Paper text:
The glycosyltransferase [name], which is unique among all CCNP BGCs, was expected to transfer a glycosyl group onto either the terminal COOH (5 and 6) or OH group (9 and 10). The monomeric [name] contains two Rossmann-like β/α/β domains. The N-terminal domain from residues 6–208 is a substrate binding domain consisting of seven parallel β-strands that are flanked by seven α-helices, while the C-terminal domain comprising residues 229–392 is a UDP-sugar binding domain with six parallel β-strands surrounded by seven α-helices. A glycosyltransferase with relatively broad substrate specificity transfers sugars to the newly generated OH/COOH group.
We further attempted to understand the structural basis of the [name]-catalyzed enzymatic reaction. Crystal structures of [name] as a free enzyme and in a binary complex (with 9) were obtained at 2.50 and 2.24 Å resolution, respectively. Superposition of free and complexed structures revealed a global conformational change.
Numbering used by the authors:
A (entry chain D), B (entry chain A): 2 to 62, 72 to 395
C (entry chain B): 2 to 62, 72 to 396
The structure:
Amino acid sequence: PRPGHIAMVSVPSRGHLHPSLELIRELVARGHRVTYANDPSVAAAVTETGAELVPYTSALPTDQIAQMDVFLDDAVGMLPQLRAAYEEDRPDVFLYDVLAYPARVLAMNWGIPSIQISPTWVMPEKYRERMAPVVEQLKQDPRGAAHYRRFDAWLEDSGVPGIDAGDLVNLPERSLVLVPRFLQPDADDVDEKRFTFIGPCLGRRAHQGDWKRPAGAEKVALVSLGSHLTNQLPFYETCVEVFAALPDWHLVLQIGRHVDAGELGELPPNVEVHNWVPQLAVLEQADVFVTHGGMGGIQEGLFSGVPMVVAPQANDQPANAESVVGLGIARRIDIATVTPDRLRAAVVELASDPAVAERLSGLRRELRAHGGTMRAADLIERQLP
Amino acid sequence: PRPGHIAMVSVPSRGHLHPSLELIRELVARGHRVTYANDPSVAAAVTETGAELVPYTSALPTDQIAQMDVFLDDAVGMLPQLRAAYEEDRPDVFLYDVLAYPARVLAMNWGIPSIQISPTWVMPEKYRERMAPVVEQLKQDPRGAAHYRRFDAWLEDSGVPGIDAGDLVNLPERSLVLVPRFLQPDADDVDEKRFTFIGPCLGRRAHQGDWKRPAGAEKVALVSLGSHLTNQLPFYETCVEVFAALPDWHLVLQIGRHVDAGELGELPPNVEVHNWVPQLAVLEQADVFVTHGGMGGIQEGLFSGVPMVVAPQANDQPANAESVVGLGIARRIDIATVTPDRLRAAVVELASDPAVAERLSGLRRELRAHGGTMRAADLIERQLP
Amino acid sequence: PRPGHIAMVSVPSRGHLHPSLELIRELVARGHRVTYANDPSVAAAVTETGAELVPYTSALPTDQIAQMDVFLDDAVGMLPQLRAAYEEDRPDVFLYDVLAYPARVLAMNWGIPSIQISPTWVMPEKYRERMAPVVEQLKQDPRGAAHYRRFDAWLEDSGVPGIDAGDLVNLPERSLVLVPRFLQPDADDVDEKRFTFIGPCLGRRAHQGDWKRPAGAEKVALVSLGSHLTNQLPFYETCVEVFAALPDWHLVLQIGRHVDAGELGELPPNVEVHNWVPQLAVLEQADVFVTHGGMGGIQEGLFSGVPMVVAPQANDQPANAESVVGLGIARRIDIATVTPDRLRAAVVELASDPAVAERLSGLRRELRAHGGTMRAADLIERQLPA
């Protein structure tokens, strides 16, 4: 495994930084020089891995095409910054997050092997063709048919005309998918010659403290859309509403950076309110976990053996909700409606059902069997001379 | 000649980065080492040139004296960062944007030639004295006579006591003016022993996303407020109002960065609306161009041979509007008061008038004759050993 | 002596940057390699010193426990950035601001001497034991059961379990305190085997634009709150009211970047108003200085021999106000309550009282005797190899 040059590229967004931290640390511990290109705003997390931070300015922070336009601008701006950074310091292999595909373009120009690191499930080969009509239902908007023209023009300018705008990005050379197969929708339609389901990349055990039950709390709940974004005030009060007059339960509600006030000047020991909680520490001793369905929270709930109440909002979240529902460990709620009775029902049932608990035990064993960081590091070292 | 070290210094502001991009790229293509010092927020544009990014922290983002205070802070902060970056890596020549005159101070301290790169027209040798009372009649405010004292003190602190606060900044040793002489007010008062009118610095067209005329469109119009920030929602509706019931014409409206909200239900088939358009690509098929009168849009409208309807607001835009009006290729409107009937009239006259078209052909010919990037690069290379 | 590598670490806040600029410049002027690790937002001040800027991303930008969490995150984020930057370029000594104690953790791992640079007075080792109940009465909030415990866990990760979370931070090996002893509360309870009172670190008589006196002003006054930020417009009206009635005085009022919205008339010829003035330059010709009591402003008024009217607002300013009042060179006012009559008396009396002028002359003499930048640089060079 001759020490070689490994270049990791990602973006500052939280869901694209944490999933691969322990994988990068393992590559450093094996004697390789690892450079990590990301925005300096996440220099703390990058440097803690032990990798060389290679700073670049990220352009990432309403319309559907507008969201695609911002992502294209970041790719256009990202590529020259990596080229200047690595021109005289070329790596043996390029690792890149799903949103850092400009790194693949650089690898193709220099004849260097590249590996995609997917922080969540990938799009199946039948899923691409199924979404092809929406592409033509985007070219009649004069905005969607200028975005793709700009995208194809950028690929031609960047020295890779013989590849599709879909193939580049969503059809990598080789890819490491950091979710287990049972959290990947339509996994049988995913070609495992190309994609490898690794599962999460973990490392011994995290620190930042502990969190034990308040005495006389029989069942513990964590409600946190805390992967990143929260803002739904009416639903939060319903959570305190449900757990009010419900003793033996302890609600640990995380309302998030955007709120801190709004509470009720007192509040029983039944409800404790934070803007941030050590989610792993609370999840280790919790009996139910309410979440938005982000892959990071679900995999953390899975690893801790805690059933989940999923309230999907964005695009990755509904599919995640169906998966854990199909695994018999979760219920799906609709943030638009939901009642305290329906909320309390999903909460009280999930914590009592012993069949749910046995399924978490099995999924916990299936989770590790996917290989984790040790399997991923061996597969990356395979690409080194 | 022989490969040397060329140091370019500019600021992140939009009008001070784009005008010289192709000039720096041309200097790199000639085998020179070109370092480009700018704020990391524009690292994408700097690196794409092929130049070595040399980061420094910019202090650039109320009142007139308040505006003068921030610009002085940036000059005070810029000089030590350039000194530290170039202390042991001194270049053969210093190139600096008009707002990066601290680079000239470094060149004077180190006996290095310096060249000012002006992205628009410079201040004439007599236009200053008409404002000289206002400058001296502002030294009556204890704000104008402490700011200059701060400016004068900084010159003494920086090792250049033998120069006026006006001379350094507004009287460079050598300067490259990136506009044609016919876009420079009072050109006869510009000493061309010192300033050289280069015109815009171009280098082929990078496509950036093509835009073909819609089939069955007689003449195409582009509405985009020229060079920097926009906010005019009511004028946007009048544009859609005018081009509604104006068939055979195709309106390409750019609503711009911010405040995009406030669409209009269906939008007629005549009007297609974007937040950003490839302005060079659209101007290639345009027959009239509505703009704010920024030098960037005007020079881009000139190069494409497209008559312009100019709606100046602040800064350079009123003077720029008179220039293109004096050239017989543009009409000036007041966005607050223009009426829908007058808008279609100014538009329909400009696109139909063949005398306007002939003047544009001549102005296109005059534009190239100023030399462009090839002349600018040749003049810069003369300052190399 | 022999040129070595000195690494300074600080934070972007203004009161943690200016106090040590001239000290770093002196260490550079003495032929040493000085690296200065700070956030790039403050790169201008770092580079002007002449030191090598070592950039790291700072997480520093109501509730007692909430403030403690944000400071811990920045310390947690700072340490790996410092380790990566200095791992193969290790310094002979680590200099660190009070808020950059992760540099001390780095120095302990590498067996390197470290020196704390305190920009203001330190906490005597009796106030902490007095603060032990507040520590005990803060662990009862279920926020009180996650934060410090996270801090203790962080020490174990960083390789320093054999040190307390309080002792590390507030009990350095060696410390340079950049205030004189008469501006340090409970100075006798401060162990000077560990802490050294240096006084401010100065360097020549600067410009900042300079400021000549207007003719026909008998005595000049400068009004500028704390050492940076304010938001209280109403107090400003009383200042011009008091002076626009003393035609013999010349007021130089600093309203601050965070206002400008709202003035009064065209302004009398007695009053000149800015959002920012060269405070050192105005102090050259001033006869009274109104301030909130920030340590930066107080030491500048003290060094200029200018009596002060102190209007404390946030933390440290009342204790600083208490100090300068006890020294017989200042009067204390409450911006919320003070009236024009009490304000005008404090201004004219302080400027007229010759006993105050004599006390200022003596304190300025006491100021220099603490050693300043030359003493501090000599003490740092002692930790360097011969």
